[PDB]
Amino acid sequence: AKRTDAQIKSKQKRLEKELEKAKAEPVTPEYTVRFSIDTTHKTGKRFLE
Amino acid sequence: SKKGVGSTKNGRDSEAKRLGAKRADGQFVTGGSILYRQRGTKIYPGENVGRGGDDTLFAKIDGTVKFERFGRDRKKVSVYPV
RNA sequence: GCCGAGGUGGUGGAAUUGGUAGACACGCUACCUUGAGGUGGUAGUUUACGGGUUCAAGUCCCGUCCUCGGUACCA
RNA sequence: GGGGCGGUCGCCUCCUAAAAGGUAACGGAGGCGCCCAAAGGUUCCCUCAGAAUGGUUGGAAAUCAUUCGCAGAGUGUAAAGGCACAAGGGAGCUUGACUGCGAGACCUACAAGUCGAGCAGGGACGAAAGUCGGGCUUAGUGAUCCGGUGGUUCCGCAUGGAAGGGCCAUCGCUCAACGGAUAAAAGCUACCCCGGGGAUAACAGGCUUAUCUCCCCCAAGAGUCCACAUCGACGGGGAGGUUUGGCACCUCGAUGUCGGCUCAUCGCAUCCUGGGGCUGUAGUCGGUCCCAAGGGUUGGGCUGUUCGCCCAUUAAAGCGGUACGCGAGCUGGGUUCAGAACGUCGUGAGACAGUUCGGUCCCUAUCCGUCGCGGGCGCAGGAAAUUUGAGAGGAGCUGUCCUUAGUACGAGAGGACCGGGAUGGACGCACCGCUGGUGUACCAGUUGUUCUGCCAAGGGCAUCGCUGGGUAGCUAUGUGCGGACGGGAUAAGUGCUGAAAGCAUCUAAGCAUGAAGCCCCCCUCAAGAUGAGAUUUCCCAUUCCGCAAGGAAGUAAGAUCCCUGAAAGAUGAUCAGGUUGAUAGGUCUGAGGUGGAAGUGUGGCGACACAUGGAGCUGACAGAUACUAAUCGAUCGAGGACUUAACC
RNA sequence: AGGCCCAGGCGACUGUUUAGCAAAAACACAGGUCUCUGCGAAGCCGUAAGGCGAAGUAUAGGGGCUGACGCCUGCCCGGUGCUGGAAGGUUAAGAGGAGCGCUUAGCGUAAGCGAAGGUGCGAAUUGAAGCCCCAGUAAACGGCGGCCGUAACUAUAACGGUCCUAAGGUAGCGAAAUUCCUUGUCGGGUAAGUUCCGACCCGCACGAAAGGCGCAACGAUCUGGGCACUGUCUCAACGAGAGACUCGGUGAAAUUAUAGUACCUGUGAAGAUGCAGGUUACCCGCGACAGGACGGAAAGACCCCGUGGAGCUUUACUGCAGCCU
RNA sequence: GACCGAUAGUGAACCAGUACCGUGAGGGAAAGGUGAAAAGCACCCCGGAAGGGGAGUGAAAGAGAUCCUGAAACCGUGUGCCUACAAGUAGUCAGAGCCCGUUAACGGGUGAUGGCGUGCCUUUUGUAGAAUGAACCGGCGAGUUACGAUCUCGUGCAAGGUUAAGCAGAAGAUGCGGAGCCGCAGCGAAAGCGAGUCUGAAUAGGGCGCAUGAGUACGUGGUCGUAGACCCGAAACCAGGUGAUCUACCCAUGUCCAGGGUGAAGUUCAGGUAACACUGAAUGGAGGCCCGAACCCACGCACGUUGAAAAGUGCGGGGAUGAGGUGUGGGUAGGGGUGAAAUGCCAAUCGAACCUGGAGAUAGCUGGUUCUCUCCGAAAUAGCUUUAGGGCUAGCCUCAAGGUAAGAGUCUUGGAGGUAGAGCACUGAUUGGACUAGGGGCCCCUACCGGGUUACCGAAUUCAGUCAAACUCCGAAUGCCAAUGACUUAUCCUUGGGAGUCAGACUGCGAGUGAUAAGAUCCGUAGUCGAAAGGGAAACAGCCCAGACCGCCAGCUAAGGUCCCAAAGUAUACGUUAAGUGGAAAAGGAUGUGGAGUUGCUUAGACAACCAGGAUGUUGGCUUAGAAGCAGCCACCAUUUAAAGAGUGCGUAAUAGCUCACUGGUCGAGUGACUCUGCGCCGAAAAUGUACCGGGGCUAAACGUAUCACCGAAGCUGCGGACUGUUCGAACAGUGGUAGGAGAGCGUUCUAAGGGCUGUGAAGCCAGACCGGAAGGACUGGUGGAGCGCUUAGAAGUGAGAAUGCCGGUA
Numbered sequence A: 001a002k003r004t005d006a007q008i009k010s011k012q013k014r015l016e017k018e019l020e021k022a023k024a025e026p027v028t029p030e031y032t033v034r035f036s037i038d039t040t041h042k043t044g045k046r047f048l049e
Numbered sequence B: 001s002k003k004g005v006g007s008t009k010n011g012r013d014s015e016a017k018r019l020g021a022k023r024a025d026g027q028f029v030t031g032g033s034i035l036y037r038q039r040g041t042k043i044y045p046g047e048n049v050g051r052g053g054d055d056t057l058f059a060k061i062d063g064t065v066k067f068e069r070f071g072r073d074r075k076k077v078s079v080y081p082v
Numbered sequence C: 001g002c003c004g005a006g007g008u009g010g011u012g013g014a015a016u017u018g019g020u021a022g023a024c025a026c027g028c029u030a031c032c033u034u035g036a037g038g039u040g041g042u043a044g045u046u047u048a049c050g051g052g053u054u055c056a057a058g059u060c061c062c063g064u065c066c067u068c069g070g071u072a073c074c075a
Numbered sequence D: 001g002g003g004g005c006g007g008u009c010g011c012c013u014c015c016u017a018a019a020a021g022g023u024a025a026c027g028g029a030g031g032c033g034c035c036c037a038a039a040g041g042u043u044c045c046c047u048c049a050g051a052a053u054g055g056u057u058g059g060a061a062a063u064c065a066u067u068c069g070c071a072g073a074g075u076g077u078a079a080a081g082g083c084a085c086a087a088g089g090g091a092g093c094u095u096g097a098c099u100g101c102g103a104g105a106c107c108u109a110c111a112a113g114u115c116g117a118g119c120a121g122g123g124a125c126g127a128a129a130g131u132c133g134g135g136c137u138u139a140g141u142g143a144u145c146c147g148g149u150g151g152u153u154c155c156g157c158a159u160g161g162a163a164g165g166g167c168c169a170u171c172g173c174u175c176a177a178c179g180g181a182u183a184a185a186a187g188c189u190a191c192c193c194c195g196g197g198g199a200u201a202a203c204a205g206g207c208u209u210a211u212c213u214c215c216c217c218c219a220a221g222a223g224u225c226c227a228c229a230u231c232g233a234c235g236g237g238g239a240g241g242u243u244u245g246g247c248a249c250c251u252c253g254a255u256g257u258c259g260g261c262u263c264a265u266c267g268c269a270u271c272c273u274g275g276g277g278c279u280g281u282a283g284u285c286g287g288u289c290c291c292a293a294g295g296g297u298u299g300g301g302c303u304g305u306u307c308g309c310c311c312a313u314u315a316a317a318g319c320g321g322u323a324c325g326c327g328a329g330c331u332g333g334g335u336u337c338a339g340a341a342c343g344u345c346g347u348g349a350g351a352c353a354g355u356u357c358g359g360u361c362c363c364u365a366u367c368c369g370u371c372g373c374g375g376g377c378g379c380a381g382g383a384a385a386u387u388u389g390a391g392a393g394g395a396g397c398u399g400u401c402c403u404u405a406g407u408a409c410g411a412g413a414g415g416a417c418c419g420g421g422a423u424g425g426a427c428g429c430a431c432c433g434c435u436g437g438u439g440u441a442c443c444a445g446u447u448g449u450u451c452u453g454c455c456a457a458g459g460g461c462a463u464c465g466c467u468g469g470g471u472a473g474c475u476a477u478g479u480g481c482g483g484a485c486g487g488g489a490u491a492a493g494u495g496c497u498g499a500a501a502g503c504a505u506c507u508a509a510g511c512a513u514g515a516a517g518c519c520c521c522c523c524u525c526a527a528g529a530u531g532a533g534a535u536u537u538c539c540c541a542u543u544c545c546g547c548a549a550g551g552a553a554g555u556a557a558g559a560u561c562c563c564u565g566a567a568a569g570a571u572g573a574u575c576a577g578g579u580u581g582a583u584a585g586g587u588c589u590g591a592g593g594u595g596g597a598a599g600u601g602u603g604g605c606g607a608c609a610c611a612u613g614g615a616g617c618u619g620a621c622a623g624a625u626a627c628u629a630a631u632c633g634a635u636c637g638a639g640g641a642c643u644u645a646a647c648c
Numbered sequence E: 001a002g003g004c005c006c007a008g009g010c011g012a013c014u015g016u017u018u019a020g021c022a023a024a025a026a027c028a029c030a031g032g033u034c035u036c037u038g039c040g041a042a043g044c045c046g047u048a049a050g051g052c053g054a055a056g057u058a059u060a061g062g063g064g065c066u067g068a069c070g071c072c073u074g075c076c077c078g079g080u081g082c083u084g085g086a087a088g089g090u091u092a093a094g095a096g097g098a099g100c101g102c103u104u105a106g107c108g109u110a111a112g113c114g115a116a117g118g119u120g121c122g123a124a125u126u127g128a129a130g131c132c133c134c135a136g137u138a139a140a141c142g143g144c145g146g147c148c149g150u151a152a153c154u155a156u157a158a159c160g161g162u163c164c165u166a167a168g169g170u171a172g173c174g175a176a177a178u179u180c181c182u183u184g185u186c187g188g189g190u191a192a193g194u195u196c197c198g199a200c201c202c203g204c205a206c207g208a209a210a211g212g213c214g215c216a217a218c219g220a221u222c223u224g225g226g227c228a229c230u231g232u233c234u235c236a237a238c239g240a241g242a243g244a245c246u247c248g249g250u251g252a253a254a255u256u257a258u259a260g261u262a263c264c265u266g267u268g269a270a271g272a273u274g275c276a277g278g279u280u281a282c283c284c285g286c287g288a289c290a291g292g293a294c295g296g297a298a299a300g301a302c303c304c305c306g307u308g309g310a311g312c313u314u315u316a317c318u319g320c321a322g323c324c325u
Numbered sequence F: 001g002a003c004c005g006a007u008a009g010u011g012a013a014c015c016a017g018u019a020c021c022g023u024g025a026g027g028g029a030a031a032g033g034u035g036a037a038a039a040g041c042a043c044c045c046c047g048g049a050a051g052g053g054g055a056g057u058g059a060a061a062g063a064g065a066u067c068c069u070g071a072a073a074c075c076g077u078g079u080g081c082c083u084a085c086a087a088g089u090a091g092u093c094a095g096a097g098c099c100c101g102u103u104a105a106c107g108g109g110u111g112a113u114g115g116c117g118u119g120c121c122u123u124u125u126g127u128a129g130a131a132u133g134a135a136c137c138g139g140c141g142a143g144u145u146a147c148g149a150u151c152u153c154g155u156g157c158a159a160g161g162u163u164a165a166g167c168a169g170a171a172g173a174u175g176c177g178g179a180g181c182c183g184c185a186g187c188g189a190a191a192g193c194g195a196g197u198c199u200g201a202a203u204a205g206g207g208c209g210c211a212u213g214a215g216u217a218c219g220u221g222g223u224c225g226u227a228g229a230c231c232c233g234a235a236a237c238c239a240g241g242u243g244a245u246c247u248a249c250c251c252a253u254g255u256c257c258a259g260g261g262u263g264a265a266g267u268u269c270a271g272g273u274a275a276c277a278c279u280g281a282a283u284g285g286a287g288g289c290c291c292g293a294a295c296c297c298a299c300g301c302a303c304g305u306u307g308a309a310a311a312g313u314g315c316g317g318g319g320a321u322g323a324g325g326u327g328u329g330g331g332u333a334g335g336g337g338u339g340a341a342a343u344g345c346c347a348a349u350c351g352a353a354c355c356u357g358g359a360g361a362u363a364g365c366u367g368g369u370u371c372u373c374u375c376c377g378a379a380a381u382a383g384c385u386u387u388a389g390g391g392c393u394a395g396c397c398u399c400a401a402g403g404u405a406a407g408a409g410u411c412u413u414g415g416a417g418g419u420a421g422a423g424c425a426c427u428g429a430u431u432g433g434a435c436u437a438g439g440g441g442c443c444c445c446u447a448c449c450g451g452g453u454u455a456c457c458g459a460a461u462u463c464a465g466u467c468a469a470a471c472u473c474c475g476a477a478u479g480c481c482a483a484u485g486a487c488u489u490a491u492c493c494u495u496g497g498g499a500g501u502c503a504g505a506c507u508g509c510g511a512g513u514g515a516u517a518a519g520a521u522c523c524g525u526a527g528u529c530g531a532a533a534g535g536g537a538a539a540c541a542g543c544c545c546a547g548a549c550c551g552c553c554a555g556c557u558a559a560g561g562u563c564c565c566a567a568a569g570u571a572u573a574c575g576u577u578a579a580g581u582g583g584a585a586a587a588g589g590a591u592g593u594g595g596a597g598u599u600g601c602u603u604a605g606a607c608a609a610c611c612a613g614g615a616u617g618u619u620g621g622c623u624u625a626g627a628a629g630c631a632g633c634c635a636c637c638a639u640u641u642a643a644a645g646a647g648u649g650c651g652u653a654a655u656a657g658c659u660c661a662c663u664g665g666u667c668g669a670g671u672g673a674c675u676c677u678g679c680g681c682c683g684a685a686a687a688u689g690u691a692c693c694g695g696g697g698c699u700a701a702a703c704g705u706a707u708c709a710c711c712g713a714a715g716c717u718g719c720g721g722a723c724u725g726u727u728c729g730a731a732c733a734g735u736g737g738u739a740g741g742a743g744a745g746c747g748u749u750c751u752a753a754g755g756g757c758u759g760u761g762a763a764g765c766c767a768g769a770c771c772g773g774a775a776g777g778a779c780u781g782g783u784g785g786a787g788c789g790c791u792u793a794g795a796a797g798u799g800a801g802a803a804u805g806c807c808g809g810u811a
Ligand SMILES: CC[C@H]1OC(=O)[C@@H](C)C(=O)[C@H](C)[C@@H](O[C@@H]2O[C@H](C)C[C@H](N(C)C)[C@H]2O)[C@](C)(OC)C[C@@H](C)C(=O)[C@H](C)[C@H]2N(CCCCn3cnc(-c4cccnc4)c3)C(=O)O[C@]12C
Pocket: D254, D256, D360, D361, D362, E297, E298, F305, F310, F311
């Protein structure tokens, strides 16, 4: 159990050291708006003369 | 057999701070000397005793110390001269 | 009992607090086409729960319930 | 409370904390690594939460008045302490969230940390008094070193500068393992090595007994009725120290581990056998309980296995202690050494949360202890025999079949206690006549080669050359025997008489039965039984010293040295003998064993057969026999203390 | 001067191997394949000369892997390696020198400015390989999924849906040297078989060159059965020789505080010969036996500790040789 | 020469870098003494010699060739005393008997017998330890030196102390040499200023100073620092060499392989065809082919396992013509070679050879660390620590100088603090009743609208009760802080030198963790041990008593005891128990007894026992063929009667048959429930053996109450010594001790001035019945045969019982 639990910490120290050397951030997302519209009113025919 | 449960969660404790009487009744006491370390005002300042910023009761003048009472149920330090 | 994981529509399931009964693929319903089915075309149905935080909650937080698995009594 | 894992590492508050202060544990709870330009300062104001009513949409509960509410509210934030003269709420004005300090204190190993009246300079608010060096107190943070920034009547390697340094103010550290080893760091080791510890783990011992095993109380209920035939819930009380554990007290200058083998012994909580009481015990069989540890308690298949299941017996195939008895007694299959492989994990060396094949079990016994055998002396003379028994050891088990008797019982099916008899199993003791074994100086056959000069007859060697028999001795698988009959006292139990207590009662008195158990009977050892015993019998009380006690020195009866030896034996010992003698060897007769000797003759060409001829040979066997050796010797070995009593 | 037969696992075999615990299923092997290398080859030894390779020349020579033979060797190039490309981004030192300090003649009544020079620093620009990027390669390193519904119901799913992935384990094999559950279940062998054999297949946790499946022969290999055979055992007995034992000669050694060295129960550093209370025991040897002297031996090999060591590993840290540029 | 003297000093006093050991590099000993001189034993005897006894020589022959002296271990001979029914850490104390007759004194050797008694060392909380170390004896073997720092003590000079190198001088002292160093003046980072000075704006405040002034040069001593720094000990690392005579592979070059089988390719012949294929004979001789000797290798067993042998023997086993065995010559060398790969092999070494150097690596770890007495005497704790078995500071100990009577106890008095207890007034928990908005459920209709009910739950109110470490309206006993006086004892404070200790244990109490288990763990508190002997608890660190300077053949006591082991009461008085309770344990069970308290029956008459009653309404009706209760309901009813339930027992498959109930007669006075408590009973089992009194054994020799004696310690007292401290020869007080601090000495070797004793016999050695408080010191006698003590100083290679120490001798 001690032999397995010494590996279980060695791999975590390797993990944290490679993550401090890596420092590769998640990529910031591109920009979207979604924005859209409705204007769904029942409307007549004639507007501008 | 040794089955594992851990995690006490309650190890820590703060350092003992020495509240309470530092000088006694009828004690000769110089100026500026701390008469009572407390939190809150368990005991009030009376004559010639000031309450500090950490509400310790200290003596403003030289003289003996008296712990009288503030009447109903309440105490008081007062320093008198000789 | 303890630890770790997930609880969405009939289904499998994405969603870094910012609009989802559902946005995505199926089912499902009503119609059309066809002799009648199938395919195809048109339209349609509160996030396990309860209480907050917030202008805004599936998400952030505190508790309850369920299911997967590891870890036990026993056969 | 071994190490790893988990958890923690610094600071604050409460409880532990034992009415000062302090105080630990991997004790119980919580928080912190900040926030606020007002949530600071001052001045002036003023009082909270809830409840009961009146009130739209307003809801149980917003806001309103209204009474009652010295306190739950509020206090930026955990928790404690504190607060309504506000520290809690408003509004104005403000920057003291100042600079240089600081008498004196608390705290503390240090480093640090906390409080501080007052002084001066400049202010804020206030009419003034005054208050203000942050907040309601305690958390909200880290040394130094090295660098940055700002400022300075500081220094500046000859001089003037400068580079650079100092000082002051300050910034960069989750250096979070928070008094911070570096600016910078993860693993394998079964290929391993060293220095230490029983300061520290496992085994076994010890304390404990939660757990385990066992026992019991209460009694609801089950048991057709009926708690107590047998069961016994919910709960309760204990014993034991065999389980899994707790703790680390002995051992790390070594306390070898499981299973098996050999050998046991002990406890009784009894598996069989013995005796019993209760029954929901008709009988055979049973169930439970009490007494009893005397004896016994199997052989196989698989597994390393203990365990377990199975097969087939048994009267039964008991549970536990002894370092899970027993490795200076044995085995080494399993597990945990080095090789190697599979599955799986790891990037990896390697590892196991697994499996598989192979793998050095050392020691001449000093003491105690066991089992045997001797040698000395004792035992008030010296000797030879036979002994009593204190004491001690052994043995102590039991089947089946028949008779009683198909009787008792039962409706039947089924089927007895008790009382007799035979024959067994295991075990034990003896012995070899029988059956067998072994028999290496017995007898025979035969091969190879070699020797006796040759044929014939023999010898050597080849495991005793091999092979077929085999005497004595030793021996079991063979034979003979035994554990039987009984007393006496009991245990459980069953009772008589019988009160205390006009009765009842196995009771205190008085008596009696009653078990494989206890003491005997049976077998062995046994007077070192220093408590040294008792019988019957032999020898007798001599010689010098010396003045005695006493010494020594010839003996008696008796024994030994030495010798022939076996019925005995490691050696001693025992025993049979030592010339008036069969103790051994030889001899000669025999038994037994082997089997038809050699020579000769005949028959056959010959291998060979047959006769002479139950022949010849013959180790340990037994009966005669003085043939040979037990020769002559020599040594040791009594002279019997004292007192008293009794006798004559 | 052979024991033999029946079946199985692994390895084709003959060989080799831990001298002194492991002889093997481990190495090696013929075979297969991948890759390097145009010959001053590649790789290797050496700082270099000089060599090996090799007086060899791709049918040759190094290196990895797998191991005769038979049938075969599936999917994934997303990650890591190689291999190729390289337009572009980055990227060193060296180059370049815009400028800013510092000093200073001089100008300035002060304050300050200040040429040239020296000197300290230094921006833009250029600057390879590598890396980022784009493709190929799995007999390279490696990896090879879930869930839901659906058939005369009693069950499963040929089928369909949908997430996820780089792809979701194909053939063949499967309680195996791999199966924890476990002594799976069924069948055989056996009176009885946790092992064995043949099946099944919910494969904890097989699987195709860490090769998959078979396979005649071979094997001081491992495993199960059987014939013959036997003191291996029921259950021991006897005989022979060498020691042991007695006598004559010779004569060590480990060990060892001094020892006139009992056994119960107890106590005690918790397991006494030595202590306590009892119980027993004349003095001295000889052959035996090994229960104790926590016996002898080896300053525990297990466990922890030491801010001990040493071999190994890697995407631990920091370096170095080599190799590109 | 204040160096060595044969285990020392070179490794080597001697034919020594020798003998040995290794292939090699390299490692590396042991071992001195006749005499003044050979005068080294002519001669005789035993003896084969060896070796002797005489005789000679000699001063000595005990001086005779490993030879001066010649210890101890060890081994022998003779005898004085003891010893063959007694277990004895081996002694000591008592003690007869015997045998002697000394350094002549409360002699000496032995000791039957009695009481007591589990070695030394180290490490430990604790060791007889079944933990370690040593077989014994002997020698050797560990805190030293240099330079520097500081403190005490000493001396000189002192606000001035003093030179170093050097020169001269017998390896000297001394003279010269003041260059230098430390001080006299501090403060500040520095400029600087100066009895002041920095900070500061400050004439302020504070820090550090001096006004209350001693240093300096040497010397002894303590300690620290740098050196191997107190001895011994690693595994390891590095540098340069030496090794393929073993073994791995390779290179050149030879050589070995008895015999027997199987029988490939090919070839030939015959058949066969169109020719081939093909078939069959023969021939041939292949083969990491087979069986099997030599040889090689090692798998199985048994033996050996202080071996025949540091890897073998015996019996079997594999290969045994090719990846073969093997000889000879040769090559590769350590961070390297070699490897059909095991990290295997590289000279009986291998996860990195051996040797020599760095090197006396380092070791926070283990072991040891040697003479004595006296005064005093700890700690096992806090904080911090890559720290946890280590270290530093503080606490605790010691010495000195100081200040000096501050300390300490108790009484009186004043305070702070909120536990134990208690209480509910907060905060939580929580039992029941009363009401009680409301939530359901039965529903009625009906716009869930209105309701109608329930003993179905109830938020909030009230009364009454409980409980709390993190609850307090309250609040102790103590402990704590003081002042004040009062007594009563001295021990605090400061400064400096030196430490050690940071593993603690158990018991009583207050808590925690644990299971309100543990000889458990962790704190507070007090004791004891540690570091404490003596007496008791049988034995027993830690429990109870009490603290050891020493002697005594003296007394009184503590705890514990008084029948015998075994000292003291078979003591007294009054009760209890009878189980061996005492001398082991619970729930629970029980007519065991002793003592207190009430109550009912109660001579117009109980209890026990004897006799007769065993009913009436009504023989009780259903689920039922029954139940006169009786397998179970329904009334718990009511008079015949002095007295009877329609039922508590028994029984049947149920009634049946009965018994008690309940009252009468006979009898003739204690009887029949309950509570408290004292002492007992069962409940009650385990492992070699009585085995839970120590034993015998006890019925008081147990227990309870009470009283008086006595025993009982190293306590106290008496007497007599010794030492230390206090007051000025006496008084008073004291004196266990680990680590450790301090003080006084003893001894060894050498040197120095003195002194003198030794050939009429030095040191050494061997004996003694001598002296001193110890270490130790003489005096005789005997061996020895030439050096050695005493007094005062000095300097140390300074004292051994322990290192699994080294060497030697011997068990
Ligand atoms: C032959 C007997 C050997 O014993 C055993 O090895 C073994 C039987 C043991 O059981 C023995 C008693 C062990 O004790 C045990 O140790 C354990 C670690 C602990 C045990 N207890 C403490 C629990 C303890 O009993 C131990 C440790 O031995 C290892 C004792 C220790 C002192 C020894 O090592 C010991 C000296 C062994 N040895 C070492 C060489 C071994 C290599 N080798 C093998 N063969 C040869 C050989 C052959 C032929 C020729 N040459 C050489 C050489 C020998 O030469 O002989 C030995 C004594």
